[PDB]
């Protein structure tokens, strides 16, 4: 799970 970046 979670997520992050940077975009
Ligand atoms: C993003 O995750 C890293 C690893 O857990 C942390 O060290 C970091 O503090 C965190 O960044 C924060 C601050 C930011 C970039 N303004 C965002 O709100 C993110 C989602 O959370």
Given at each position: ?7
């Amino acid at each position: 799970x979670x997520n992050x970046x940077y975009x």
